[PDB]
Design a protein around this ligand. Structure first.
Ligand SMILES: *[C@@H]1O[C@H](CO)[C@@H](O[C@@H]2O[C@H](CO)[C@@H](O[C@@H]3O[C@H](CO)[C@@H](O)[C@H](O[C@H]4O[C@H](CO)[C@@H](O)[C@H](O[C@H]5O[C@H](CO)[C@@H](O)[C@H](O)[C@@H]5O)[C@@H]4O)[C@@H]3O)[C@H](O)[C@H]2NC(C)=O)[C@H](O)[C@H]1NC(C)=O
Ligand SMILES: *[C@@H]1O[C@H](CO)[C@@H](O[C@@H]2O[C@H](CO)[C@@H](O[C@@H]3O[C@H](CO)[C@@H](O)[C@H](O)[C@@H]3O)[C@H](O)[C@H]2NC(C)=O)[C@H](O)[C@H]1NC(C)=O
Ligand SMILES: *[C@@H]1O[C@H](CO)[C@@H](O[C@@H]2O[C@H](CO)[C@@H](O[C@@H]3O[C@H](CO)[C@@H](O)[C@H](O)[C@@H]3O)[C@H](O)[C@H]2NC(C)=O)[C@H](O)[C@H]1NC(C)=O
Lengths: 323, 216, 173, 219
């Protein structure tokens, strides 16, 4: 006739949660802890855009694989995106020594200064800077690496070169060179005019003398003879010296680089859409508010932890039992 | 309001023959000398096309093999002869009283000779692998009739959890069905096997049709 | 559930009472309605939202997990890298799912506790002036007022004022 | 020559409102009644309401009298329809049609969707035969479309150049993400001799992505 009643709220939300004692229980109020949505684009970390390599590999990037020309002078970036199967790697067949480390070292870096370490005009006068391969084609035209110089002989001679570079750039510089192994001894006599060739590159923290080895090889990219690539990071203040009498593809452009943190290598086919989200994945960017995302394992910068779970909802309210 | 009860619900007529569709009505659809009843053609993925208006008037363009007839509480539609194109669903529609209402709809199936599915199986893409998952698709194109059964065997052991099947409606120029099956396995569990087989048991053969692949 | 109140002797939830999670009804002679207990519902929201904010805080966000790429002759390292990544994902996934499955019961049990605790707070005031009838309801043996309906909620009921009147009506049931 | 062009597919959360548009051209728009019909997947066609763009005179189905509102723009020759407080049952395909007692000319139809997930574009994965075995003079090819929430996707082949027996299977939902497949049947002589790209579109996110299919690898 005249009463007081104690009860507990019920709402029309169908938010379902799983507990230890039972599962799939409908609840008044819930919060989702798992972020389950991306956008499938390549945003700009923080404000600095990525470096989309596109067709090129990181190998063809640094050496300037002539089909990679327009992605040069892009020295400001937040992270580098490679196609999973890059079909423009090293134009000249051969071995790229310590590829993976240079790949890893060029993941921390955030700035280059592409500078001419050995200017062609005033550093290789006696020799021939006109070294072009047919394999490194561009516009149906023979070209070569736009960061190295194929040094052949001039006027039939090829004297002992002994140039050197002092690291006066106050930062770590990354020098790149190549050693030649001609197809047969005949071309070795014609390119460098010495059957006993040597290339040494020496610094305060590096010394490796290269001897070439001319032999028959399987044909790759139509050029039988192979070029072998090598690299070294000069400490600020040391001097690297190059001396040779044959088979040296010397650097022309080196990279004075400043390390940073926050960048890496993602490979994906996503498009770039100028969307400035706080963290990227190969399959897009994360809304970034939650503490758990299952979109993809590989991430770049201030994403939530990756857990391979379907849904993680936390009960904030209580059991929903309406009329 | 008026409810248009349409008969039959499913229909199958062989080529070069007549097809009859009835449409009863809760009330009499008659309006000052004519019957405000219309028929429509809806092929899958398309909006309805207007066939017959005011219970017998054929609209221009569409061929003269379509016949609308009837008066009062019930009307009929004839197709003579039925063509391959006519693989679609058909609705009746009254326009006498607010609100205008449609019938339940009926699907026209063309009876043709039986067929054998041309089976195709594709491995997951390399880019798909990087997503933390992988899916093998088994295409079954150009068979007849509907009934077909696909079974997935991972290294010979039949797998039934994680399959996804979707059928296509009859081709408008082939009188022909298709369907596709997809296993959605994890990236890790996909790489724990080599033999991936999808067998299809059909009316066209006593023993199942099989096509498969290995990762080498 | 665990204290017998939620989905127990309070068989269902009130579709009304949007004011909060817990409350009273007080079907009176003047007018019925709903009124949520602001005291116990503010403790509940302040505790659950501290639970949730505590949980995320213990998991600092991860930065720039890129995935190392090894060559054709370092398979031992590559398989090692997989285990140290898939291993962490195995732990973090497992260590997160159970944190959800476990603490969701504690959120439901905590609501079951609060209602049970609140139902006894009303009982301890209405000692013999009322009876228990509809499993969470009290019959006023003294014909309470809206003044006195608010005078059962904020610690504002006393037996003595209505006791002897209540003592009268108990003798006929 | 008379065409009703409809708007794009839309996605909204329950309780919100939408304007769907239908622009007319090819006839005297100012003079003929406009119509809206609702088709739930599977269930039957339902007529909604009518606008007469000469006078703005409206007729409303007794069922839809509160859910739908109709207007028109005479200068722009466009018809607008507004739906309020959308629920699950309103998720369907909506058609704009012209006619008074016989719905004559129909629109394209948009698929407005009402659910919890969000707009995500799909990834496209090519599907190569894999085994180098000639099943016949023909080889079947295809593209898979995974992970996209709002339903409409259109799969063309070489920008629609290949109409020869192309199949587009209906999408299937897995954990709030539609996935579907497409196939072709191109002569084995002209593949991989000639480029076979599949062109897919997701109108709900304005994303067009291509992927020429190529044979598999390990070679
Ligand atoms: C940047 O990226 C682009 C795109 O990939 C590159 O262009 C690509 O170049 C390659 C190589 O030139 C092209 O592939 C060749 O295409 C030509 C047609 O012009 C064709 O003749 C050639 O056949 C080769 O493939 C066979 C497959 O194994 C080889 O085995 C074969 O060699 C055999 O036969 C000779 C006969 O003398 C023997 O001597 C050999 O030993 C061997 O037995 C033959 O060489 C390839 O198919 C490719 O087509 C082209 N891309 C496009 C889209 O066309 C650029 O080169 C790259 N940039 C740089 C600087 O590298
Ligand atoms: C990156 O490399 C890929 C190949 O690895 C390049 O794809 C190529 O794209 C071109 C178009 O730019 C295709 O060329 C032809 O186009 C004409 C148009 O007239 C058409 O008649 C041909 O059928 C063909 O489509 C070429 O086929 C395609 N490559 C292959 C192997 O099919 C891409 O262009 C490169 N991107 C950059 C920025 O360098
Ligand atoms: C190419 O190499 C030749 C060497 O075969 C360079 O020629 C001469 O090199 C010397 C030593 O570097 C230069 O010094 C001068 O030598 C003369 C010898 O009589 C001496 O009298 C001088 O006091 C001085 O020490 C010499 O200037 C140089 N000659 C010329 C004409 O340049 C040559 O410079 C190299 N480059 C080119 C472009 O030829």
């Amino acid at each position: 006739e005249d009463t007081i009643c104690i009860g507990y709220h019920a709402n029309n939300s169908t938010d379902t949660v799983d507990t230890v004692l039972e599962k799939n229980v409908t609840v008044t109020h819930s919060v989702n802890l798992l972020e389950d949505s991306h956008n499938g684009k390549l945003c700009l970390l923080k404000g600095i855009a990525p470096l989309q390599l596109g067709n090129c590999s990181v190998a063809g990037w640094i050496l300037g694989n002539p089909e990679c020309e327009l992605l040069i002078s892009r020295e400001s970036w937040s992270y580098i995106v490679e196609k999973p199967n890059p079909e423009n790697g090293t134009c000249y067949p051969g071995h790229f020594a310590d590829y993976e480390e240079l790949r890893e070292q060029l993941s921390s870096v955030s700035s280059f200064e592409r500078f001419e370490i050995f200017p062609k005009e005033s550093s290789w006068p006696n020799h021939t800077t006109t070294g072009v391969s047919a394999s490194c084609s561009h516009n149906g035209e023979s070209s070569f690496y736009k960061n190295l110089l194929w040094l052949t002989g001039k006027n039939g001679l090829y004297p002992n070169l002994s140039k050197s570079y002092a690291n006066n750039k106050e930062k770590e510089v990354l020098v790149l060179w190549g050693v030649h192994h001609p197809p047969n001894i005949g071309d070795q006599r014609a390119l460098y005019h010495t059957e006993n060739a040597y290339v040494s590159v020496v610094s305060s923290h590096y010394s490796r003398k290269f001897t070439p080895e001319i032999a028959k090889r399987p044909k790759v990219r139509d050029r039988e003879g192979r070029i072998n690539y090598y690299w070294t990071l000069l400490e600020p203040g040391d001097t690297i010296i190059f001396e040779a009498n044959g088979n040296l593809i010397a650097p022309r452009y080196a990279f004075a680089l400043s390390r940073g943190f926050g960048s890496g290598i993602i490979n994906s086919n996503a498009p770039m859409d100028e969307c400035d989200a706080k963290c990227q994945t190969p399959q897009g960017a994360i809304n970034s508010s939650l503490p758990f995302q299952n979109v993809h394992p590989v991430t770049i910068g201030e994403c939530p932890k990756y857990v391979r779970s379907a849904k993680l909802r936390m009960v904030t309210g209580l059991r929903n039992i309406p009329s | 309001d008026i409810v248009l009860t349409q008969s039959p619900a499913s229909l199958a007529v062989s080529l070069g023959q007549r097809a009859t569709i009835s449409c009863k009505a809760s009330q009499s659809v008659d309006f000052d000398g004519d019957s405000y009843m219309n028929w429509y053609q809806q092929k899958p993925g398309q909006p309805p096309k207007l066939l017959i208006y005011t219970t017998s008037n054929l609209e221009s363009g569409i061929p003269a093999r379509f016949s609308g007839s009837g008066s009062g509480t019930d009307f009929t539609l004839n197709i003579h002869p039925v063509e391959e194109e006519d693989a679609a669903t058909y609705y009746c529609q009254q326009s006498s009283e607010d609100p205008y209402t449609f019938g339940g709809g009926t699907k026209l199936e063309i009876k043709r000779a039986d067929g054998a599915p041309t089976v195709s199986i594709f491995p997951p893409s390399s880019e798909q692998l990087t997503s933390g998952g992988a899916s093998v698709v088994c295409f079954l194109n150009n068979f007849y009739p509907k009934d077909i059964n696909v079974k997935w065997k991972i290294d010979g052991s039949e797998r039934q959890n994680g399959v996804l099947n979707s059928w296509t409606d009859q081709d408008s120029k082939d009188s022909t069905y298709s369907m596709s099956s997809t296993l959605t396995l994890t990236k890790d569990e996909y790489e724990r096997h080599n033999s991936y087989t999808c067998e299809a048991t059909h009316k066209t053969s006593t023993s199942p049709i099989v096509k498969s692949f290995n990762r080498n | 559930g665990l204290f017998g109140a939620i989905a127990g002797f309070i068989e269902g939830g009130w579709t009304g009472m949007v004011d909060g999670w817990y409350g009273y009804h007080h079907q009176n002679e003047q007018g019925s309605g709903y009124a949520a207990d602001q005291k116990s519902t503010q403790n509940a929201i302040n505790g659950i939202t501290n639970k949730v904010n505590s949980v995320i805080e213990k998991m600092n966000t991860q930065f720039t997990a890129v995935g190392k790429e090894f060559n054709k002759l370092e398979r031992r390292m590559e398989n090692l890298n997989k285990k140290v990544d898939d291993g962490f994902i195995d732990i973090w996934t497992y260590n997160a799912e159970l944190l959800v499955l476990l603490e969701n019961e504690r959120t439901l049990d905590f609501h079951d506790s609060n209602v049970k605790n609140l139902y006894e707070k009303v009982k301890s005031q209405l000692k013999n002036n009322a009876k228990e009838i509809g499993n969470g309801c009290f019959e006023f043996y003294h014909k309470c007022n809206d003044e006195c309906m608010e005078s059962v909620k904020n610690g504002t009921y006393d037996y003595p004022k209505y006791s002897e009147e209540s003592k009268l009506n108990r003798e006929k049931i | 020559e008379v065409q009703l062009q409809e708007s794009g597919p839309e996605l909204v959360k329950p309780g919100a409102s939408v304007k769907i548009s239908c622009k007319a051209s090819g006839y005297a728009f100012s003079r003929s009644w406009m119509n809206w019909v609702k088709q739930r997947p599977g269930k039957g066609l339902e007529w909604i309401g009518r606008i007469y763009p000469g006078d703005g005179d409206t007729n409303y189905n007794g069922k839809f009298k509160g859910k739908a509102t109709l207007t028109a723009d005479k200068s722009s020759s466009t018809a607008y329809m507004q739906l309020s407080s959308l629920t699950s049952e309103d998720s369907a395909v909506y058609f704009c049609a012209r006619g008074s007692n016989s719905f004559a000319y129909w629109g394209q139809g948009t698929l407005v969707t009402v659910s919890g997930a969000k707009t995500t574009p799909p990834s496209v994965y090519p599907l190569a035969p894999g085994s180098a075995a000639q099943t016949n003079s023909m080889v079947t090819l295809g593209c898979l479309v995974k992970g996209y929430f709002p339903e409409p996707v259109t799969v063309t082949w070489n920008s629609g150049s290949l109409s020869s027996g192309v199949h587009t299977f209906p999408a299937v939902l897995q954990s709030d993400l539609y996935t579907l497949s497409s196939s072709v049947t191109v002569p084995s002589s002209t593949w991989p001799s000639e480029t076979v790209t599949c062109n897919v579109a997701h109108p709900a996110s304005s994303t067009k992505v291509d992927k020429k299919i190529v044979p598999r690898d390990c070679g």
